[PDB]
């Protein structure tokens, strides 16, 4: 039988998560020796990542913590942590340990499938029950960025293990494509967004792609990346760009295209999506990344970019259109997980009071 | 005779600066009744603004505060505050009070002429004497943004008073042009930057300007603004864009132009400057606004934008080029001074220790 969950949470929250680079993920093998190594790694690392973020959940305002949906998500994290604790004393040499471990990871992944919308219901419950306040809102914003990035990282570890140690893409390493053709992903996201735009507006802007391979002008641009994450970001951006374009051109039969540039530099692989959808005033830009003003499409997309040391930035020109840029690291060695850690500095952010700001 | 300066500093630092809108500045008259009102306003408001920022100087790390150049700037602020205290008991009805007051403001403006480079020498002295450290560096960054924005605001008040109550542009209200033609300022800044680029490189990119007046497509874009501030920002941006363009095209006789779009929306007047100067990796972008990595051209330009509720943002694409955007408020009623205030929230920022960050 197991100890009470808080004993495990306190134990594992003392450790810092260990960030892996894309290259490290990529250089992970599929042998028995490798599966045992993955097992011995994950039975420590997953509990560390679960515990670290569970400790930050406890720092949320009582108001948010008291909501049924936040309490529900907490309970899932507790059970998932306990599921892994069952493996602490198990022998990696026993093939049944390994197969049971993979089954346990699948069960955890499914348990947590609806975490994003469930947390969003928690935010709504807080607003409905108590009314929102600026202090709680700032804490929620800080927390959710960290919580969702933590979740992305945990899903990455689980997907890598289950895909490698249990199809279409045998050149992929788990969910990683060592030769991801960026323009092909751009086209896939455009195609899917076009289906949606065509359905509702009976029209959609065309796509124009330009590549700038600075060091090798002829060569198609490739990278090591998780294509599903890149797809997610581009699909969200195309939906917004298409909607803006059609909605700002109600009188017109001719729609300006969405232009995408893919640039490969020494350090960055940058993807800029430019539309002439009429733009948004600067005042309204920050709110596009707010969990409260919402529709977590944009904030979660930016977290995917940030997860491997990239970013997603918007700059609009009200009256004209908008540019969105996805910044990725060009090199797999620079693509290192960005993971929140529970410590004093973290703890300090939730320690805020209501007072006059430092500006007039 | 006067009280010791600290007594005045404590008294006036209790008040918050009072931000004025561009419209309020603009609706200020030049009569005798108006000059007395300006006097009675400024003999309170200037001491409040001087005292508020002097209190924050005292919050700097001992290391920075101990430098000769920071001590020198402090001493100027003390004397300027005392100069104004001489007017506390003077009668506004006496025309000699008014003329002496204008003389005192001119003397203050001249005294403080070299504040920006003198503070920069203070930063260098701290680095040379002690070596820099991350905690002090963060405090310096926070402080200098506020200090330089405060200074901009004090110079604005002084220039308005001295220009109105003591030439080429009689349609200007002090330093304010109620009908500033934005493209004409763009062209002036380009011309001056071209002279510099031509001198050093014997070549420079051409300029292309496009205006998008969303609500009135034919009409040239105008605004209420201080043209010298807009010029300053554009001149800095053109110098950077030109240098990048020529330096990334050493082999070429044909230079890509710098393209400027001026867009007027419902709320924003946005100016985007686009170059094909080869770009900068994202990692190096933040540092362009750092006082420590430096060359205060960019950070001070962004402060001018922020001063009337605007901003100046850079987004590059490494391997291709860079876009810089100046965001201004379109309406004089939205163009309100952005002024730092000395209070608890302000005080808290300088209260930081060296510890592990909240990220891995
Ligand atoms: O500028 C934008 C816009 C916003 C984002 Br985020 C983006 O990634 C691309 C865009 O073009 N919009 C969206 C939108 C939707 C309906 C109507 C107007 C607008 C104005
Ligand atoms: O991308 C840039 C660049 C930077 C800024 Br800030 C700007 O406002 C415009 C630019 O185009 N640069 C500057 C510069 C100077 C010499 C050489 C290369 C580069 C690359």
- DSSP letters, B131-163, are ---HHHHHHHHHHHHHHHHHHHHHHHHHHHHHH
Confirm or reject: Cβ of B54 under 6 Å from ligand 2.
no
Residue B236 designated active-site: yes
Burial B103-122 (b: 16+ CB within 10 A, else e): ebbeebeeebeebeebbbbb
Taking 3-state DSSP, the helix, strand and coil percentages for chain B, each rounded to the nearest 5, stand at 55, 15, 30
* Catalytic one of A35, A45, A236, A337: A236
* Burial environment of residue A302 by CB neighbours within 10 A (0 to 12, 13 to 18, 19 or more): buried
Instruction: Tell which residues of chain A come right before a gap with C–N over 2.5 A.
Output: 166, 294
B212 at the A interface (CB within 8 A)?
Answer: yes
- Hey, CA dihedral for B283, B286, B292, B295, is it positive or negative? positive
B279: chain A residues, CB-CB within 8 Å: 263, 265
The answer to whether B259 and B210 have CB atoms below 8 angstroms apart is yes
Listed in sequence order, the residues at least 6 apart from B161 whose beta carbon sits closer than 8 Å to its beta carbon are: B38, B42, B102, B105, B174
Pairing status of strand B321-329 against strand B268-275: antiparallel
B341 at the A interface (CB within 8 A)?
Answer: yes
Separation CA A34–CA B289 (nearest Å): 46
Instruction: For residue A23, give both structure tokens.
Output: 């290259």
If DSSP codes are grouped into helix, strand and coil, which group holds residue B195? Answer: helix
Q: Is A297 annotated as a binding residue?
A: yes
A278 at the B interface (CB within 8 A)?
Answer: yes
Distance from CA of A125 to the nearest CA of B (A): 28
The answer to whether A347 and A37 have CB atoms below 8 angstroms apart is no
Q: What angle do CA A176, A177, A178 make, to 5 degrees?
A: 110
C-alpha distance across the termini of chain A, in Å: 59
Residue A161 designated active-site: no
- Hey, CA dihedral for B109, B114, B118, B120, is it positive or negative? positive
Ligand 1 centroid to Cα of residue B227, in Å, is 31
Closest in A267, A272, A323 to B281, CB measured: A267
B contact residues 311-330, partner A, Cβ 8 Å cutoff: 311, 313, 315-320, 323, 325, 327
Q: CB B345 to CB A337 under 8 A?
A: no
DSSP state of B351: -
B346: chain A residues, CB-CB within 8 Å: 358
Residues that constitute the known binding site of B for ATP: 236-243, 275, 294-298
* Burial environment of residue B168 by CB neighbours within 10 A (0 to 12, 13 to 18, 19 or more): exposed
The answer to whether A51 and A12 have CB atoms below 8 angstroms apart is yes
B72: enclosing H helix or E strand: helix B68-85
Q: How far is CA B18 from CA A61, B46, B56, in A?
A: 34, 10, 17
* Catalytic one of A239, A272, A306, A349: A239
Q: What angle do CA B327, B333, B339 make, to 5 degrees?
A: 70
Residue with tokens 């203050």: B108
Q: Output the DSSP codes for B217-253.
A: TTSPPEEEE-HHHHHHHHHHHHHHHHHHHHHTTTT-S
Ligand nearest to the CA of residue B293, numbered in listed order: 2
Burial A76-90 (b: 16+ CB within 10 A, else e): bbbebbbbbbebeee
Residue with tokens 């500033």: B180
Separation CA B64–CA B71 (nearest Å): 9
Q: How far is CA A211 from CA A60, A153, A183, B276, B317, in A?
A: 45, 30, 8, 14, 12
Technique behind the model: X-ray
B195 at the A interface (CB within 8 A)?
Answer: no
Q: What class, spelled out in words, does domain A172-338 have in CATH?
A: alpha beta
Ligand 1 centroid to Cα of residue A285, in Å, is 10
Residue with tokens 């000699």: B96
Q: What is the residue with the minimal CA distance to atom 20 of ligand 1?
A: A244
A 10 A CB-CB count for A41 gives 15
The answer to whether A248 and A198 have CB atoms below 8 angstroms apart is no
Ligand 2 centroid to Cα of residue B323, in Å, is 10
Residue with tokens 């867009």: B263
| Residue A172: alpha-carbon gap to chain centroid | 20
Separation CA A215–CA A213 (nearest Å): 6
Separation CA B322–CA A217 (nearest Å): 19
Separation CA B10–CA B54 (nearest Å): 10
Ligand nearest to the CA of residue A287, numbered in listed order: 1
Listed in sequence order, the residues at least 6 apart from B263 whose beta carbon sits closer than 8 Å to its beta carbon are: A279, A317, A318, A319, A320, B211, B212, B214, B269, B270, B271, B272
Return the HEC string of chain A. Answer: CCCCHHHHHHHHCCCCCCCCEHHHHHCCCCCHHHHHHHHHHHHHHHHHHHHHHHHHHCCCCHHHHCCHHHHHHHHHHHHHHHHHHCCCCCCCCCHHHHHHHHHHHHHHHHHCCCHHHHHHHHHHHHHHHHCCCHHHHHHHHHHHHHHHHHHHHHHHHHHHHHHHCCCCCCCCECCEEEEEEHHHHHHHHHHHHHHHHHHHHCCCCCEEEEEEECCCCCCCCEEEECHHHHHHHHHHHHHHHHHHHHHCCCCCCCCCCEEEEEEECCCEEEEEEEECCCCCCHHHCHHHHCCCCCCCHHHHHHHHHHHCCCEEEEEEECCCEEEEEEEEECCCCCCECCCECCCHHHHHHCCCCCCCCCEC
Q: What class, spelled out in words, does domain B1-171 have in CATH?
A: mainly alpha
Ligand 2 centroid to Cα of residue A227, in Å, is 31
Distance from CA of B326 to the nearest CA of A (A): 10
Q: Write down the domain spans for chain B.
A: 1-171, 172-338
Q: CB B360 to CB A349 under 8 A?
A: no
| Residue B287: alpha-carbon gap to chain centroid | 18
C-alpha distance across the termini of chain B, in Å: 59
Burial B336-349 (b: 16+ CB within 10 A, else e): bbbbbbbbeebeee
Pairing status of strand A258-264 against strand A207-213: parallel
Beta bridge partners of A328: A269
Separation CA B57–CA B143 (nearest Å): 8
Confirm or reject: Cβ of B298 under 6 Å from ligand 2.
yes
* Burial environment of residue A18 by CB neighbours within 10 A (0 to 12, 13 to 18, 19 or more): middle
Distance from CA of A281 to the nearest CA of B (A): 6
Q: How far is CA A217 from CA A209, A264, B68, B97, B258, in A?
A: 15, 10, 53, 71, 22
Separation CA B279–CA B248 (nearest Å): 9
Instruction: For residue A105, give both structure tokens.
Output: 């990871």
- Hey, CA dihedral for A318, A320, A326, A327, is it positive or negative? negative
The answer to whether B349 and B340 have CB atoms below 8 angstroms apart is no
Q: How far is CA B250 from CA A220, B67, B190, B197, B239, in A?
A: 25, 43, 21, 14, 17
Q: How far is CA A252 from CA A40, A121, B265, B282, in A?
A: 61, 39, 20, 37
Residue with tokens 């450790």: A15
Beta bridge partners of A208: A259
Separation CA B277–CA B255 (nearest Å): 9
Confirm or reject: Cβ of A324 under 6 Å from ligand 1.
yes
Beta bridge partners of B272: B261, B325
Q: What is the residue with the minimal CA distance to atom 10 of ligand 1?
A: A241
B138 at the A interface (CB within 8 A)?
Answer: no
* CATH fold match for the domains A1-171 and A172-338: no
Q: Which of A29, A221, A64 is nearest to A136 (CA)?
A: A64
If DSSP codes are grouped into helix, strand and coil, which group holds residue B316? Answer: strand
Q: CB A345 to CB B358 under 8 A?
A: yes
Backbone φ, ψ for residue B175 (5° rounding): -100, 5
The answer to whether A322 and A315 have CB atoms below 8 angstroms apart is yes
Q: How far is CA B82 from CA A36, A129, A290, A348, B160, in A?
A: 76, 55, 47, 41, 21
DSSP state of B317: E
Ligand 2 centroid to Cα of residue A332, in Å, is 26
Ligand nearest to the CA of residue B275, numbered in listed order: 2
In Å, the largest CA–CA distance within chain A is 69
* Burial environment of residue B238 by CB neighbours within 10 A (0 to 12, 13 to 18, 19 or more): buried
Q: Which of B206, B271, B292 is nearest to B242 (CA)?
A: B206
Instruction: For residue B97, give both structure tokens.
Output: 């009070």
Q: CB B327 to CB A282 under 8 A?
A: yes
Beta bridge partners of A264: A213, A269
Q: CB B346 to CB A358 under 8 A?
A: yes
How long, in residues, is chain A? 360
If DSSP codes are grouped into helix, strand and coil, which group holds residue B331? Answer: coil
Q: What angle do CA B57, B63, B68 make, to 5 degrees?
A: 75
A277 at the B interface (CB within 8 A)?
Answer: no
Residue with tokens 């779009």: B261
Separation CA A37–CA A293 (nearest Å): 44
Listed in sequence order, the residues at least 6 apart from A88 whose beta carbon sits closer than 8 Å to its beta carbon are: A43
Instruction: For residue B320, give both structure tokens.
Output: 């291709």
Which resolution, in Å, applies to this structure?
A: 1.8
Long-range contacts, A139-143 (Cβ 8 Å, 24+)? A139/A59, A139/A60, A139/A61, A139/A64, A139/A349, A139/A350, A139/A352, A140/A60, A140/A61, A140/A64, A140/A291, A140/A292, A141/A290, A141/A291, A141/A292, A142/A349, A142/A350, A143/A56, A143/A57, A143/A59, A143/A60, A143/A350
């Amino acid at each position: 039988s197991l100890a009470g969950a808080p004993k495990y949470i306190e134990h594992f929250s003392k450790f810092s998560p260990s960030p892996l680079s894309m290259k490290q993920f990529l250089d992970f093998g599929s042998s028995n020796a490798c599966e045992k190594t993955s097992f011995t790694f994950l039975r420590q690392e997953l509990p560390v990542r679960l515990a670290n973020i569970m400790k930050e959940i406890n720092l949320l305002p009582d108001r948010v913590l008291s909501t049924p949906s936040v309490q529900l998500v907490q309970s899932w994290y507790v059970q998932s942590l306990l599921d892994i604790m069952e493996f602490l004393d198990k022998d990696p040499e026993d093939h049944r340990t390994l197969s049971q471990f993979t089954d346990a990871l699948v069960t955890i992944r499914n348990r947590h499938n609806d975490v994003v919308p469930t947390m969003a219901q928690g935010v709504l419950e807080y607003k409905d029950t108590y009314g929102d306040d600026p202090v709680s809102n700032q804490n929620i914003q800080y927390f959710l960025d960290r919580f969702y990035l933590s979740r992305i990282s945990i899903r990455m570890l689980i997907n890598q293990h289950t895909l490698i140690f249990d199809p279409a893409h045998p050149k992929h390493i788990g969910s990683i494509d060592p030769n991801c053709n960026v323009s092909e992903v751009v086209k896939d996201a455009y195609d899917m967004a076009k289906l949606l735009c065509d359905k509702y507006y009976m029209a959609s802007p065309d796509l124009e792609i330009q590549e700038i391979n600075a060091a090798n002008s002829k060569q198609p641009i490739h990278m090591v990346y998780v294509p599903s994450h890149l797809y997610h970001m581009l699909f969200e951006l195309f939906k917004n760009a298409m909607r803006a374009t059609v909605e700002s051109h109600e009188s017109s039969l001719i729609l300006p295209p969405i232009k995408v540039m893919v640039a490969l530099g020494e350090e960055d692989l940058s993807i800029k999506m430019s539309d002439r959808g009429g733009g948004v005033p600067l005042r309204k830009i920050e709110r596009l990344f707010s969990y409260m003003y919402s529709g977590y499409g944009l904030p979660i997309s930016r977290l995917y970019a940030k997860y491997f040391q990239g970013d997603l930035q918007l700059f609009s020109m009200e009256g004209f259109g908008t540019d969105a840029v996805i910044y990725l690291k060009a090199l797999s060695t620079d693509s290192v997980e960005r993971l929140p850690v529970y410590n004093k500095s973290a703890w300090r952010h939730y320690q805020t009071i209501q007072e006059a700001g430092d500006w007039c």
